[PDB]
Amino acid sequence: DNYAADVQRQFNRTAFDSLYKICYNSLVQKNGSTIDFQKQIDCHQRLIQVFAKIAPIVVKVE
Amino acid sequence: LITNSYDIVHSWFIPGLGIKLDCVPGRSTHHTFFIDNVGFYYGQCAEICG
Amino acid sequence: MSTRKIFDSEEQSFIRLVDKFYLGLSLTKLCAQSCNLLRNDISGSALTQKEKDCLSICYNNIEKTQSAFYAKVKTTMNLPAVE
Amino acid sequence: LSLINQYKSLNLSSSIKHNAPFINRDLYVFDDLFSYNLGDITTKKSLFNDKNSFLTSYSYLNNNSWNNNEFDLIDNLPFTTLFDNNDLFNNYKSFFQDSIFNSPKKQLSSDSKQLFKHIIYRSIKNNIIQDYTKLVKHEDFDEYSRWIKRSPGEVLPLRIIKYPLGLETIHNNIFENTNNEGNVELFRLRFNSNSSKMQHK
Amino acid sequence: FPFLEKMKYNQYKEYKNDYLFYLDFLKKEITDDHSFFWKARKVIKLPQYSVFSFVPLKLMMWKTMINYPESFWYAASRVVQSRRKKVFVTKCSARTLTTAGWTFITPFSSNIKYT
Amino acid sequence: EMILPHNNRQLARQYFDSLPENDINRKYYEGLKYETPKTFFGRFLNQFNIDAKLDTLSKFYTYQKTIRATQAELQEDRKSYLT
Amino acid sequence: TEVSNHNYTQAVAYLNRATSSCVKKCDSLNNNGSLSSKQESCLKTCAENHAIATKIHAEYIRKLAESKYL
Amino acid sequence: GGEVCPPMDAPTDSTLFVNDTFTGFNPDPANPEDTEQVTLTEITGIVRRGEQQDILARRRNWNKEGIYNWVDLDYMGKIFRLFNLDAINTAYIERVVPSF
Amino acid sequence: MEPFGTDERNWTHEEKDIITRFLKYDKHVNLKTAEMVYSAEVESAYFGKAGALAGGVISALFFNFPIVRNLPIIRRSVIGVLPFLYCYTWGKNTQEELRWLKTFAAYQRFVVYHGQHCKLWV
Amino acid sequence: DKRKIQHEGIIALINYSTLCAQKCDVLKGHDDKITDTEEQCLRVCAEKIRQTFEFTNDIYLKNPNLTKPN
Amino acid sequence: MDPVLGDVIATRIYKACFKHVYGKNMKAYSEKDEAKFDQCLTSYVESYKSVTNHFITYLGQLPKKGLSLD
Amino acid sequence: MEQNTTQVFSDLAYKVCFKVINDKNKPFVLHDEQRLANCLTRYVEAFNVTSEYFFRE
Amino acid sequence: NVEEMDTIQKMNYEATVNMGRQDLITREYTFYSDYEFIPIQEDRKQQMEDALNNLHKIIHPTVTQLKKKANVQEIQDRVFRKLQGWEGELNTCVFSAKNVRDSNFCADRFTNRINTEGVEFVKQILREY
Amino acid sequence: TVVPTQTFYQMQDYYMLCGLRFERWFRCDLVYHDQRHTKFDQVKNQKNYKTYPCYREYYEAQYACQDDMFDFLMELAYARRAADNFESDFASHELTTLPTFYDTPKAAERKTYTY
Amino acid sequence: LNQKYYTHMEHLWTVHVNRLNQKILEDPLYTFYPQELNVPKHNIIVPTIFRDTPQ
Numbered sequence A: 001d002n003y004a005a006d007v008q009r010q011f012n013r014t015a016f017d018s019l020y021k022i023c024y025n026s027l028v029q030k031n032g033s034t035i036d037f038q039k040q041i042d043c044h045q046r047l048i049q050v051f052a053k054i055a056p057i058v059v060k061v062e
Numbered sequence B: 001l002i003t004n005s006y007d008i009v010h011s012w013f014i015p016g017l018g019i020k021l022d023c024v025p026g027r028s029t030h031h032t033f034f035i036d037n038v039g040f041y042y043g044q045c046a047e048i049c050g
Numbered sequence C: 001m002s003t004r005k006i007f008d009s010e011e012q013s014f015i016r017l018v019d020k021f022y023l024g025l026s027l028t029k030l031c032a033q034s035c036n037l038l039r040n041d042i043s044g045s046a047l048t049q050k051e052k053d054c055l056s057i058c059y060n061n062i063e064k065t066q067s068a069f070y071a072k073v074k075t076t077m078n079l080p081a082v083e
Numbered sequence D: 001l002s003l004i005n006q007y008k009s010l011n012l013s014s015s016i017k018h019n020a021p022f023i024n025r026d027l028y029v030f031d032d033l034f035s036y037n038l039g040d041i042t043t044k045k046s047l048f049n050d051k052n053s054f055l056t057s058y059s060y061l062n063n064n065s066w067n068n069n070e071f072d073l074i075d076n077l078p079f080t081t082l083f084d085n086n087d088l089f090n091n092y093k094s095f096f097q098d099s100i101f102n103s104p105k106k107q108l109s110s111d112s113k114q115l116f117k118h119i120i121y122r123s124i125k126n127n128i129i130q131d132y133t134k135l136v137k138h139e140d141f142d143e144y145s146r147w148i149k150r151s152p153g154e155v156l157p158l159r160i161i162k163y164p165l166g167l168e169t170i171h172n173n174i175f176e177n178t179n180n181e182g183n184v185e186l187f188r189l190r191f192n193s194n195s196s197k198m199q200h201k
Numbered sequence E: 001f002p003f004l005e006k007m008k009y010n011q012y013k014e015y016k017n018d019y020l021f022y023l024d025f026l027k028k029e030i031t032d033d034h035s036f037f038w039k040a041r042k043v044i045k046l047p048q049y050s051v052f053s054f055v056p057l058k059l060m061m062w063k064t065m066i067n068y069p070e071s072f073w074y075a076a077s078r079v080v081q082s083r084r085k086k087v088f089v090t091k092c093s094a095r096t097l098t099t100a101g102w103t104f105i106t107p108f109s110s111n112i113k114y115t
Numbered sequence F: 001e002m003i004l005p006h007n008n009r010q011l012a013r014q015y016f017d018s019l020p021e022n023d024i025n026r027k028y029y030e031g032l033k034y035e036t037p038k039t040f041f042g043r044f045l046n047q048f049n050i051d052a053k054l055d056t057l058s059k060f061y062t063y064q065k066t067i068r069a070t071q072a073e074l075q076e077d078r079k080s081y082l083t
Numbered sequence G: 001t002e003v004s005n006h007n008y009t010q011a012v013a014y015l016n017r018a019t020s021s022c023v024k025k026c027d028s029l030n031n032n033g034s035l036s037s038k039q040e041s042c043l044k045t046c047a048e049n050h051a052i053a054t055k056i057h058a059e060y061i062r063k064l065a066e067s068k069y070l
Numbered sequence H: 001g002g003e004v005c006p007p008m009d010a011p012t013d014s015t016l017f018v019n020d021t022f023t024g025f026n027p028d029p030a031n032p033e034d035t036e037q038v039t040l041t042e043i044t045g046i047v048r049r050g051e052q053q054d055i056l057a058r059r060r061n062w063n064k065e066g067i068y069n070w071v072d073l074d075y076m077g078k079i080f081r082l083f084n085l086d087a088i089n090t091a092y093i094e095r096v097v098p099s100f
Numbered sequence I: 001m002e003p004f005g006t007d008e009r010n011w012t013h014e015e016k017d018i019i020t021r022f023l024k025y026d027k028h029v030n031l032k033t034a035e036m037v038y039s040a041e042v043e044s045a046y047f048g049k050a051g052a053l054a055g056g057v058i059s060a061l062f063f064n065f066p067i068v069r070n071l072p073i074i075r076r077s078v079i080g081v082l083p084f085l086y087c088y089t090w091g092k093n094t095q096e097e098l099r100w101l102k103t104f105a106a107y108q109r110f111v112v113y114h115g116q117h118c119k120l121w122v
Numbered sequence J: 001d002k003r004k005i006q007h008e009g010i011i012a013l014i015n016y017s018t019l020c021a022q023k024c025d026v027l028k029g030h031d032d033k034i035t036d037t038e039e040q041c042l043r044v045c046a047e048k049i050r051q052t053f054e055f056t057n058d059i060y061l062k063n064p065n066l067t068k069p070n
Numbered sequence K: 001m002d003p004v005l006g007d008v009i010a011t012r013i014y015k016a017c018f019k020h021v022y023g024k025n026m027k028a029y030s031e032k033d034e035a036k037f038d039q040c041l042t043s044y045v046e047s048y049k050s051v052t053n054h055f056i057t058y059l060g061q062l063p064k065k066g067l068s069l070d
Numbered sequence L: 001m002e003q004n005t006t007q008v009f010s011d012l013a014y015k016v017c018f019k020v021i022n023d024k025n026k027p028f029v030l031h032d033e034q035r036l037a038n039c040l041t042r043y044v045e046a047f048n049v050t051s052e053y054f055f056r057e
Numbered sequence M: 001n002v003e004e005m006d007t008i009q010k011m012n013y014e015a016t017v018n019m020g021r022q023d024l025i026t027r028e029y030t031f032y033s034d035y036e037f038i039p040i041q042e043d044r045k046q047q048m049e050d051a052l053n054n055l056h057k058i059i060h061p062t063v064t065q066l067k068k069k070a071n072v073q074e075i076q077d078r079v080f081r082k083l084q085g086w087e088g089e090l091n092t093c094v095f096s097a098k099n100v101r102d103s104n105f106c107a108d109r110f111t112n113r114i115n116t117e118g119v120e121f122v123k124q125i126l127r128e129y
Numbered sequence N: 001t002v003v004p005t006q007t008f009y010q011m012q013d014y015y016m017l018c019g020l021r022f023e024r025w026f027r028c029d030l031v032y033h034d035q036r037h038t039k040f041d042q043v044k045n046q047k048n049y050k051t052y053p054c055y056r057e058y059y060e061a062q063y064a065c066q067d068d069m070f071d072f073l074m075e076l077a078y079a080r081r082a083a084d085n086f087e088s089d090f091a092s093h094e095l096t097t098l099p100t101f102y103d104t105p106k107a108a109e110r111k112t113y114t115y
Numbered sequence O: 001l002n003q004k005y006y007t008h009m010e011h012l013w014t015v016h017v018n019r020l021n022q023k024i025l026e027d028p029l030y031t032f033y034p035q036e037l038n039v040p041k042h043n044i045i046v047p048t049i050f051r052d053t054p055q
């Protein structure tokens, strides 16, 4: 089957999760229980855009 | 000499020295020996060892 | 450096791709930190002109050193061929 | 009878899709979220997560990783050559002589299974990953051994011992034990370290 | 003493009271079943024979043994002329089989290992 | 038997947090001394409060081994005497 | 004695992690190609600490697995 | 110990070459632990509940005499030293083949 | 572990049951002690069951004795019930006594393993 | 596949627990016993994380435009 | 091991060198940046060698059996 | 996948325990090793508690 | 070092190393049935050792000045009885301890007891003797 | 001499003497067993070697006892050390002995030292 | 039952009153709480790494 497509789906899910986790880590405060959901969503979108821009340069076969 | 037996009560009898030490199991028989002369002596078991 | 052929050709290619993806994720995080895109005072999900310029500079720097650094590391390690 | 209502939840993945600290996994854009030079993949490749333990997973997957080799065969380090420094080679051999640093694949698999079961029970508590058979453990220790001796009860964690007094009359110094402070040490504290360890004869 | 060995037929004891697979127990091949093969007591390098009879001469005709009410001890006694009149020769091999004289000596008299 | 202060949950204090304002125990918590009546007739008047005292103790000292043993023994003895 | 390639890979990964931690802690990168005396001392101390930590973590994982089994 | 049907093929994903999480089955043709080398197989069939011993139906199994006439799962498990004796006695499966 | 002395309260039946249950499943229970407990629990039931059966059998004959056969209903019922109760008591007492004695022996063995007995020092 | 989905969920759970504990500072050299206050803080952080994840899923499920190719 | 391990180590070293060069200074690439990366690579190699030596020694120093010495 | 998850958990625990413990980067002792083990145990317990709470608790 | 030693000296060094490293070998075999107890912390051991050292330093004047082994043994026995009661309480708390928090609490209690009341007892004993 | 031979010198066989010497040596050893490799002659720093506190006790015990009895007592003492059972941790026999003038409360006042 | 339980409960109530008077809101020294309120014992206890003593 489309093993490339499946690996791409897995990698994209992992990248989105990592971006969300990084945004949460940056935007969390007060030892947890203090974070903004809208700001987290905006940061996740911005990180998704940044990682999409970076994807062509780094993730490739050498 | 701490005389002792491993299996059954044996007896070391030096006839020239006139000594007879009965090494028995468990009994650590501390017996003195003073040979007032230099010599070589032979002996056998004074207890029937089997 | 006791190296042998454990992973197959396809395994090596997939592992290289995965390593590249992970390095790219780490580089994206570092670039965001350097370009202040991860500021907690962010008002939107967009990057201004200055942030875009910083991202472009970071991308150019990453491109300008990836292959060279990889080749230099390979030569410095001087990993013997497996046979 | 013990299985009348012992297993009610079975689709743990159905629970995984509910309580996982993650976004929904049905995002179709996730299939084509980004673009990469994927190349050719004729077989399924599983994404190895984490920057550190990713390749290690592949290490557990490849069969050749379980190939034993002599210390002569492993005669180099990623940045150093162990052939030159005999001391470094001996240190590496000692590091490889520890069982924890050279555990086998069967033990690795058993540890992985136990860790997976513990993670499932401590997180979901589905009671399905738990073992089916009940195991009764017996300490079949034969007391007829003059080389191995068990400890009835156990060693008390701390004990206070008074050092013997008047045992030595060599220099008429009845105080035998004197600490580094120089004061006569009359009492000493003996602490037990390992509860399960035996005692050398 | 080879005849005295009752453990030789101990396997048939398992099938004596367990008849479920008894026929299976009878499906094996006989190696010493109802047979006593004595190892050679002498060296005979005559390649004409693959094996040589080491069975007792007096026990050759089992028919003659079917009427005499005596055990196999007849064949074991005084059937060889070998003698070694040496003081160093061992004739007892039972150092535990002795007596403790008029005065029974302990523990030498009161223990199986010694007495 | 000893419950460590780090591991001792003040459930009894929780019961103290739930009692009403007019609680004699609260007055006892305030320092109201309670004395067993030493007057014969008065002691007779004290003979009818055993069950109420047991209920109060069970409310205050549910986890106490002595309280549990006393309650169980009293219930069993009541059953046996009634039978 | 013989060792497995999987063990070699695990040791290499542990060494890489320890080296990264030591570099990040002692700031080994802020040098002109030669580590200072303090840099080398900190590298040795951090390497010993990281080796002890790897041994302790491996022992902890093995003990958790055993307690699960036992 | 004869083979009734050929075994199943190896799974494509190398992640399946390990002992199953619940079934404990390791579909690895080359198991690193030869003591853990297992050759699995797949068998499809219908389930037939345990038969009842009935003298009227001429089902008298002289187990001590080795004569069998009823499907006694308990006796079968006792003979075979089966671990899941109760589960085996619960029910049985009559092997089926896709015709012919 | 239990108190030693005449003034000490005798062991309860529930206490004996709990002790047997602990000995049957304790992680600190040795293999030989577990084997002794299983062996005791095996044979003990047969004695009580056989006692009950023997009571049911013998008491049946007493209901047809030459004199008991011509008594009133209540008297005959009492006479017949007399042997069965005695034999049931015999069987139950024998089973329970064997179980409790072997349980006490196993508990002593465990205490020897646990070293919880004062003045028991090698 | 169920295996990949569960792996992703477990990885996300591990990452969230690690982030919460780093926020909760549940690691101390004084003792290994997690205090009741520490458990309460961890529970608060976990509830916040779960609510944030639920809100993010609700926002993403309602509109797919928030996540688009590149 | 396999060359993929060396590739992973190289990727980690490249990320570390990028952090050391452009972690806080995001500027244009140049021969100065290349030389800084080369110096960082040399320092990383030296640090890895020192860490390996110290870790192997400490792990080799920890007793595991009675000293026989033939 | 189970081995990968276990390795990831172990790596995260090791990272957290080394960050917390090797904060002064001074030489370790028996007490320091005990503190590291305590930190690892605390991390495992916190992970278990957090996972249980996330699993509708 | 070992290479700097002759055959006899090398054998002696090996003897010392092996005799000192016995426990490591003894670290191998363990009995499952034993009730495992969390070991006392090294910091707690050090604090208890410091308290014992303070007690020994206090005892040092009277112990050195005394010329009677009987008197020394009597003082030691009284102090041992008191400290043994305290240590018995501490060990009873330690054996049933379920966490490092309980271990630390028990250790702190034992150290404070040695620090506070044992000092008064020793002072009274010294003033008497 | 620490355990005088005159304690049981009336007897010809030193059985009770060997027993008492072994008990005393075991008590001393158990008192100082753990610090032998850290503070005694079993130390690594050969210039810091201090004679073991049970040196004379062990020598006297070996002199009094024989080889087989010493081995058996050593096995028994190994069992005792495994138990870690101090003689003071099980002693109750002091209650059931007749009072003696040597057991007065003020033991120091018992001795009458004169020059 | 009144005599027996009255003596017992009089002692118990005197104890309770004394405890309340000192504002002692703690449970009895021999109080056994439920299983859900019991702190479980940590099982993992790794022995320290062996090292030859310099002395």
Ligand code: HEA
Binding pocket: E100, E101, E102, E103
């Ligand atoms: C009463 C007892 C008695 C008698 C009569 C004898 C008689 C003889 N005994 Fe001895 N002997 C013992 C009692 C006796 N013995 C005992 C108890 C021992 C020790 C066992 C041990 O060591 O444990 C011993 C041991 C003993 C040994 C030890 C062997 C060894 O230790 O190496 C030897 C060997 O020289 C020996 C020799 C003889 C000889 C040569 C005679 C000759 O005198 C034999 C002559 C014959 C007789 C003396 C009998 C007389 C004959 C008659 C028929 C009388 C009837 C007549 C009338 C009607 C009045 N005897």
Ligand SMILES: [Cu+2]
Binding pocket: B010, B011, B045, B046, B047, B048, B049, B050
């Ligand atoms: Cu002899």
Ligand SMILES: [Cu+2]
Binding pocket: B010, B011, B045, B046, B047, B048, B049, B050
């Ligand atoms: Cu003889």
